[PDB]
């Protein structure tokens, strides 16, 4: 077979150091290529571009692939996934001149010097290699300026030293078209998705980057991609930034804005908006807030409101060089059923809420442009905004640095003129100013605030009740090894019931399952789901058991079941029958497997139903602890000479681990105050 | 080759297509023959411009095959293979078999109904949830049979403007006529005709109206299609005899049905040896071909990733060498499989075989009084077509959990050739007030559809408890509608429930008509416990006789978890 | 960076909110223009939503300034109680006017509760 050119051709993916001087390559790539950990590499891309880096090693990197941030992927004019030619530069040399202007659309709005605020920065000994034509950004101010390299003295290319002159000649270049500014929505530019982007990317990879492959194909490419997630997540940003990731066209639709247009006026738009996508495609059509547009379930009504889903109907089964669709919403349930039917909006994606990594990951990208004093923890910041979503941590950025604006600034009074660079430049947000944006709270966001870390409580622990791994070979095979169920024909463990006592670690035990497995969990309530409305909590059930599918393997662990289903003799309602019947068909709905554990007091309280074989067919007793468990207990939660644990552990006898919990937590809290430990088994 | 099966591709078809099609097959060809070949995910057709030995002649290894470079244009009476046949439709087999000959006539032979004075059916109703393969059949029966068709989609007609909307349904009605003999295929019909309850609307109204209208309007023929969900969706009125007085119920594929459907949308790629289709077909339980389909489509999609698209030679004119030597390979279809969606409330495996407890040691004989009950309705329902006498019209079964009630039911259903419809009493009682009722409805309604058969109520008391324990107006509106459908009947359905015992069940499901009969049926001595555990262990030491005679009152489940749990501890 | 561009105004009837509202704008020498409610809801269909646009218009024209709209759930309730394809057009027609703002003009609103 003829087999491919030369091995000095990589992929462009992503970077990993934001800095626009460097590309990573993973070593033995450098060796194959025999380059250095310094060496200034050239980077050849598209339309006979060149750039000149700096390459350093990437263990994360793969040997066909080139990490490299936006600003040289832009000077090459190459997308990710495109393929660039490196080569080695060792006959670079120290630069004599520099002449370099800004961007027009990056520097309106301010007036200083930009070399003193931007430049001299910039460069100050770095020794960054610069090619000719190449644009780079550099941020501060809380704003980016784009540079354009004008010329440089040893042309085409040179570093620029702490001798290099550096002229800057007062006039503003307009940008070129084809000059994508750096200043646009980008992948960089989302924090917290992952898994989802990994998705959506793919899905539009064929299709928007090699529409070709469909003119001589016949197979069909995804149609319409749907996104769930409360508001502020960030799918209107995905949208935007795949799209201009991938070159492709983008119009973006709004319901409220369409629904705003007089009868038939508004529906010639939604078709004038698609007719437009199509001429300008490859393209991305993301309509906005889609249920504002189609609801019709049960909540539809106007002989106008139909009219128009229907017309979106119509203008998506109309699709088929490729423009795929994108939607929001928060949730299925609010769209109308008829926008599934495959041909329409046959994918979905579930971007929920970031997790720990995730806030500061988004709290990162939002405070790139601004001067953070030293003091400012992030991660701080990150772990204390539990239910936040990125709307919730931009907000809260922006607050902290207009608050520190108003404080340093502010009362030394240079406002209200024309803002000057220096100024803007010096000023600090500090993490006093974050404390400050923090002080109010919002987002009561029904879910916790942290991304999967450990857990640690009980491992190894004393004499009597030793470790019995039931459950834990029981999600051995469905959780860990997937592929197994997928070519066999035998039924794993469906359902495992968790008969105890209250404060038996029932939760704690389900939770530390799944963590430890690298499974995702999903925790519903029994008090929570009742609380809610009639059938809008059996609308919640269903809604839980989906995400869990979507992201399985995974563990939806029931906490209080026989709230929810106590049918034996206790059960009087047309909704809780109605709750018992939907928790009984979800059940048997299964079959990644997802495995579905359920916790109460005993067998008596939950419903006979629920036993029957292909629902909860497992059962694991829990009881209380004893001397030695106690001691393992106030251990774990007296973690963060004369205390003597073997002694409080003797006299405790008939305690749990919330005993001890709150035995540690009350002692060390009257250690604040003023022993400690004695005073609050007193009260 | 054919201008319109090559576009999209640039590379040498001759090695691609013709050198593999022909390659020592000795395939004999006559000219003027147009002749299909599958590959790089599509298929090319080709017309034989003239052979050597004139007019036939067989390609053998000498032959030569010149293909002169220009691809000519298609011919109006050479319908390309590329159309919707009966053969891209799978799982439906009997449903294709109705349609078929309600079709036959009317559509092929007109002058009959010229010179006839009887009535053909004039609309024919598809029920099945989406992605079934209802428009699929519709366009197929039309292009199958010559004739012309004509498709109108709900959304499509009730986005138009009011009255605009109407133009249209009488302009399309109009036009099939033109050209009839003609198939009018109306797609989410629901979209148009809902009134039941949820009608409401000065044009909404005048909408439904029109297509009543239009449908009376009927009578070369020109027959109706249209397809929804069920029966609940469409207004009554569209049932009215001469409108949509034919249905037909496409249900979701069986085991063999998607193993089926899976073949047609594999056809045109390279599949690699490691495929294993009945595997995927397997474990694909509640799918439609719609998702058999996207199956496919991802699968396919995420070998083109890897493959062809690391090594990039995509975004220029996709080369038809590049896109045949890709194959799908079974660790793409794993990745397809990977995420899941359906979650169809039924079983994912067709009439298939059993096992469990036929000849088994001594104590508890074989006593068929349900073999015998159920032999002469199911087996021979021509038999009560010509007789007056009343079979059984339905067996209860007495017996605590884990008696295989279920287990029996099924099995007799399989044995018999007899259709199955599962319904459970905690599965009908979680639904809404009186969706519940509707579901009843339905599920009877199917059975009777594909009768002879045996609909088998699982937890019969959760239902109806009248006796004392019943109270609230959705409950006893629930056992009300369960002797309305019990009295019902009258090919033979009969109805099998299962209880704990007498005193569970309501006094009402007793009276004569409905459940007359009843059988109890306990637990398993030493002998059945042996019996028990050989089948669920089925797939030298190991004395399954030691561990029989030490489970004393076990039972089938509890001998089941007893191997199932042994063999997972010798993993 | 970006400044609040909406402020929402909570409490009972007479508590102050329109005063409020007008103080911050004229103590700020901030271009002051009323959107009432009742009043926007009571021009014939259409008419409505072209005065909503021409306010709007019009306090950017003055920027910097303050758009007070007085009872807005009057025309802003779409919860379960909204129900008009008119009803329904005004309301996005303030969605979307919203959404199109960003000398800076804040939009002030006041109603009884969430
Ligand atoms: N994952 C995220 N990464 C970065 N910013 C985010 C993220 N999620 C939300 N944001 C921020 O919040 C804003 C959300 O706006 P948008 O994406 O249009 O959400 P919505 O349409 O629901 O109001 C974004 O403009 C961005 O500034
Ligand atoms: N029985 C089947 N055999 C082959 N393909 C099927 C079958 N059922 C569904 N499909 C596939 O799924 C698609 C279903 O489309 P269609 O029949 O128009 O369904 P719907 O109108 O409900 O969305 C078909 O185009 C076909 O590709
Ligand atoms: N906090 C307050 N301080 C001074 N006057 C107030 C205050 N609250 C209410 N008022 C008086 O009551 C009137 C309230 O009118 P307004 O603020 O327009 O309330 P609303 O729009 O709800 O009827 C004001 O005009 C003012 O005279």
Request: charged share 30%; aromatic share 6%.
């Amino acid at each position: 077979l003829k087999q491919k050119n030369r091995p000095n051709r990589l992929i462009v993916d992503e970077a990993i150091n934001e800095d626009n001087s460097v590309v990573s390559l993973s070593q033995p790539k450098m060796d194959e290529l025999q380059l250095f950990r310094g060496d200034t590499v050239l980077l050849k891309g598209k339309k006979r571009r060149e750039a000149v880096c700096i390459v350093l090693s990437d263990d994360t990197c793969s040997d066909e692939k080139i990490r490299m941030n936006r600003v040289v992927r832009n000077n090459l004019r190459v997308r990710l996934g495109d393929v660039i030619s490196i080569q080695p530069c060792p006959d670079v040399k120290y630069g004599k001149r520099i002449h370099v202007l800004p961007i027009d659309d990056t520097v309106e709005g301010i007036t200083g010097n930009l070399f003193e605020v931007y430049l001299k920065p910039y460069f100050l000994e770095a020794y960054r290699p610069i090619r000719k034509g190449d644009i780079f950004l550099v941020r501060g101010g809380m704003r980016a300026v784009e540079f354009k390299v004008v010329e440089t003295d040893p042309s085409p290319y040179c570093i620029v030293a702490p001798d290099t002159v550096i002229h800057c000649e007062g006039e503003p270049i307009k940008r070129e078209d084809e000059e994508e500014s750096l200043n646009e929505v980008g992948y960089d530019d989302v924090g917290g998705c992952r898994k989802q982007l990994a998705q959506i990317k793919e899905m539009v990879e064929l299709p928007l980057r090699h529409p070709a492959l469909f003119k001589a194909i016949g197979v069909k490419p995804p149609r319409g991609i749907l996104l769930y997630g409360p508001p502020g997540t960030g799918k209107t940003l995905i949208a935007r930034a795949v799209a201009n990731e991938t070159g492709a066209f983008f119009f973006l639709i709004n319901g409220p804005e369409i629904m705003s247009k007089l009868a038939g006026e508004s529906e010639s738009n939604l078709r004038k908006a698609f007719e437009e996508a199509e001429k300008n495609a490859p393209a991305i059509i993301f309509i906005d807030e889609l249920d504002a547009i189609a609801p019709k379930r049960e909540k539809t009504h106007g002989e106008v409101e139909r009219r128009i889903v229907s017309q979106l109907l119509t203008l998506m089964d109309g699709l088929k060089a490729h423009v795929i669709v994108m939607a929001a919403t928060n949730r299925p349930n609010s769209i109308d059923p008829a926008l599934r039917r495959f041909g329409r909006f046959d994918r979905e994606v579930d971007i929920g809420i970031p997790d720990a990594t995730g806030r500061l990951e988004i709290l990162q990208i939002h405070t790139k442009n601004m001067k953070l004093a030293d003091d400012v923890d992030l991660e701080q910041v990150a772990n204390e905004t539990h239910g936040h979503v990125g709307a919730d941590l931009a907000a809260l950025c922006s607050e902290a640095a207009l608050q520190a604006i108003r404080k340093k600034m502010d009362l030394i009074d240079l406002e209200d003129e024309t803002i000057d660079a220096e100024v803007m430049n010096s000023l600090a947000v500090t993490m006093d100013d974050f404390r400050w944006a923090l002080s109010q709270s919002n987002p009561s966001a029904l879910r916790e605030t942290v991304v999967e870390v450990p857990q640690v409580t009980w491992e190894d622990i004393g004499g009597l009740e030793d470790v019995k791994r039931e459950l834990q070979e029981l999600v051995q095979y469905p959780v860990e090894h997937p592929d197994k169920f997928l070519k066999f024909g035998m039924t794993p463990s469906k359902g495992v019931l968790f008969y105890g006592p209250p404060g038996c670690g029932k939760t704690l035990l389900a939770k530390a399952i799944a963590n430890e497995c690298q499974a995702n969990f999903i925790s519903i309530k029994g008090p929570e789901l009742l609380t809610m409305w009639f059938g809008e909590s059996e609308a919640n059930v269903r809604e839980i058991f989906d995400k869990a599918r979507q992201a399985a393997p995974c563990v939806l662990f029931f906490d209080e079941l026989d709230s929810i289903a106590k049918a034996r003799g206790g059960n009087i309602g047309d909704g809780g029958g109605a709750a018992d019947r939907v928790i009984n068909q979800i059940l048997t709905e299964m079959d990644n497997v997802f495995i579905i554990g359920a916790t109460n007091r005993p067998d008596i309280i939950d419903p006979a139903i629920l036993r029957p074989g292909r629902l909860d067919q497992l059962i694991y007793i829990p009881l209380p602890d004893e001397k030695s468990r106690v001691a393992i207990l106030k251990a774990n939660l007296r973690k963060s000479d004369v205390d003597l644990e073997f002694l409080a552990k003797m006299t405790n006898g008939f305690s749990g681990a919330d005993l001890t919990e709150i035995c540690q937590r009350a002692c060390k809290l009257a250690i604040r105050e003023s022993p400690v430990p004695e005073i609050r088994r007193d009260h």
